[PDB]
From a paper:
The next unusual PTM reaction on TglA-Cys is performed by a complex formed by TglH and TglI, in which the cysteine β-methylene (β-CH2) of TglA-Cys is removed to generate TglA-CysΔCH2. Like MbnB and MbnC, TglH and TglI of the TglHI holoenzyme likely function as a catalytic and recruitment subunit, respectively, to achieve TglA-Cys modification. Here, we report the structures of TglHI in the absence of Fe ions, with two Fe ions, and with three Fe ions (apoTglHI, TglHI-2Fe and TglHI-3Fe, respectively). The interaction with TglI is required for TglH catalytic activity, indicating that the TglHI complex acts as a holoenzyme for 3-thiaGlu generation, akin to MbnBC.
Author numbering:
A (entry chain D): 1 to 296
B (entry chain C): 2 to 269
The structure:
């Protein structure tokens, strides 16, 4: 009815790392989704190619067995340059169509001066930014041709000029734009642990949870000297709690877990039989919570 | 404060080593130091969080040191393997490049990133030795310029003249670089005979990966004599010593190899 609606639930998926496929127990664990980083498979913008020719061969092998989700990180979706000159329109919108992605994911930061894992910079929580970014989000969603979701970010310092709460920015943005949301529950928990006055209840109450098409369950990232990654770089139980609350109050289309490359290290090979096995153990739990709240 | 003047304030902050030092050293009454009224207003918002701000600058500078390597793998992948084999201190060169280049963030412009890097490394004193590695970087720089030339690729005349295509470039080497092109494990490590080899860089189709193939001297001279669109008589009069205006023994066969390599367009 809005020309873009939340698709029917697909299930549990994982982010794509070359290592996971080597050891992951398909034929034992049902995995039908894979999150593909569009900036990892994109060809240079000062070149004439859309996809790097090496990645194009990889994309087709994965597409046969799995459904490929698109994640746009460092495309200047919410930058100050004209949208048509951004990496999102030039090299990301066509790549998602190559994947035939059910939907695309966006990050609510400024691509410049931001690294997704270690150091981020948030969008200004102001009325002018709700207006400016939603006008871009509405325009970008039209160009993508599929539901566009914005991922909430984890920040250590708040942007100067803040006028509203983070959830209200996301809430007012998606109402004005008509876009959707991709909730990184680890980022909510990280901000609650570190930032002052962050209300986890207010964040989930304020948010329009019926607009959440995708969920991101991630293990502990590794920032130097941050209290996060407390016991291990696996999905913490507080994050697991928000996953249950999210499914108790809404129905997302999919949930993605991440390998996150290097995350935890030990003097022994590893502090388990395999943290790679822990990936198996986390997926099964997420599949149980998903099936427990399966609405059929 | 409008957030544009906030981002506009960070890029100058993240790109100047001197201004970043002023934050850790002093916060003063007299307009801080080297900062405007509005810039100090945005800065005073971070007066309590100075320590984490410094962490962001260090993290930003660290990613650009690793953006340097990805550029060298996107463009000039062979040259990267050669520098890795001889263990040139890439972290030092990356910091030297960025500081000299004012800590620029090329972003999606990776070929422009790579072309400027190969120019910086060509003048680097650590690489003034190993003359063959300099030759490989120049060849890979022409591969970078081939990709850059296909963005807004001029225009197609489609005239009745022998003409070049934007999907091929020619690089005459100083050494026998073809030896490295076949056995990539010997990149940088071995020594090469000083022989002029005509390496044509070309894309068979616009979406494919570029390839290196060697053409002979007459094939190279035909490509050189087609620097500007030249008629049937012009191409054969320029290359032939007699100025005969008729195709020589090799010319019509090599002009066919050049077209198959997507290097030239025959008159039609």
């Amino acid at each position: 009815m809005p020309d873009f609606v939340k698709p029917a639930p697909i299930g549990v998926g994982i982010q794509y790392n070359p290592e996971i496929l080597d050891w992951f127990p398909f034929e034992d664990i049902q995995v039908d989704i894979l999150e593909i980083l569009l900036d990892n498979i994109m060809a240079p913008m000062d070149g004439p190619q859309i996809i790097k020719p090496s990645a194009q061969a990889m994309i087709e092998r994965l597409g046969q067995k799995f459904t490929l989700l698109a994640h746009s990180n460092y495309g200047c979706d919410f930058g100050f340059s004209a949208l048509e000159e951004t990496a999102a329109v030039q090299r990301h919108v066509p790549l998602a169509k190559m994947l035939n992605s059910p939907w695309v994911a966006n990050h609510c930061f400024y691509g410049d001066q931001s690294w997704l894992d270690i150091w981020s910079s948030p969008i200004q929580f102001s009325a002018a930014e709700v207006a400016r970014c939603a006008d871009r989000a509405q325009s970008l969603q039209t160009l993508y041709g599929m539901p566009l979701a914005h991922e909430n970010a984890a920040y250590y310092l708040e942007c100067p000029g803040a006028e509203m709460r983070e959830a209200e920015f996301l809430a007012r943005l998606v109402q004005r734009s008509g876009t959707f949301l991709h909730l990184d529950l680890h980022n909510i928990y990280t901000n609650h642990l570190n930032l002052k006055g962050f209300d986890l209840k207010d964040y989930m109450d304020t948010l329009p949870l019926d607009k959440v098409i995708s969920v991101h369950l991630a293990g502990g990232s590794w920032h130097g000297g941050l209290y996060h990654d407390w016991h291990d770089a696996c999905v913490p139980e507080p994050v697991w709690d928000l996953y249950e609350d999210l499914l108790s109050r809404a129905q997302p289309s999919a949930v993605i877990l991440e390998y996150q490359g290097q995350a935890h290290h030990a003097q022994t090979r590893i502090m388990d039989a395999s943290d790679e096995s822990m990936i198996v153990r986390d997926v099964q739990r997420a599949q149980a919570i998903w099936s427990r709240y399966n609405r059929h | 404060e409008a957030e544009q003047v906030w981002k506009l304030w960070r890029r100058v902050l993240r790109d100047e080593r001197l201004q970043a030092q002023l934050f850790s050293a002093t916060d003063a009454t007299h307009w801080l130091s080297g900062f405007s009224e509005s810039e100090s207003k945005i800065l005073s918002v971070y007066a309590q969080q100075f320590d984490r701000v410094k962490w962001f600058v260090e993290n930003y500078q660290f990613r650009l040191v690793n953006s340097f390597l990805n550029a060298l793998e996107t463009g000039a992948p062979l040259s990267l393997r050669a520098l890795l084999h001889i263990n040139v201190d890439l972290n030092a060169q990356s910091k030297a490049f960025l500081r000299d280049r004012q800590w620029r963030d090329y972003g999606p412009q990776v070929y422009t990133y790579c072309e400027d890097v190969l120019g910086f490394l060509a003048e680097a004193d650590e690489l003034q030795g190993y003359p063959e590695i300099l030759d490989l970087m120049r060849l890979e720089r022409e591969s970078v310029r081939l990709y850059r030339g296909l963005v807004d690729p001029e225009s197609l005349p489609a005239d009745n003249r022998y003409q070049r295509t934007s999907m091929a470039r020619l690089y005459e080497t100083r050494f026998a670089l073809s030896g490295w092109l076949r056995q990539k494990d010997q990149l940088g490590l071995t020594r090469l005979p000083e022989s002029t080899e005509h390496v044509l860089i070309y894309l068979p189709t616009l979406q494919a990966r570029h390839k290196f193939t060697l053409i002979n001297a007459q094939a190279a001279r035909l490509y050189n004599c087609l620097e500007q669109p030249q008629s049937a008589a012009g191409l054969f009069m320029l290359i032939n010593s007699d100025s005969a205006s008729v195709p020589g023994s090799a010319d019509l066969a090599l002009l066919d190899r050049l077209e198959q390599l997507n290097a030239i367009r025959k008159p039609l």
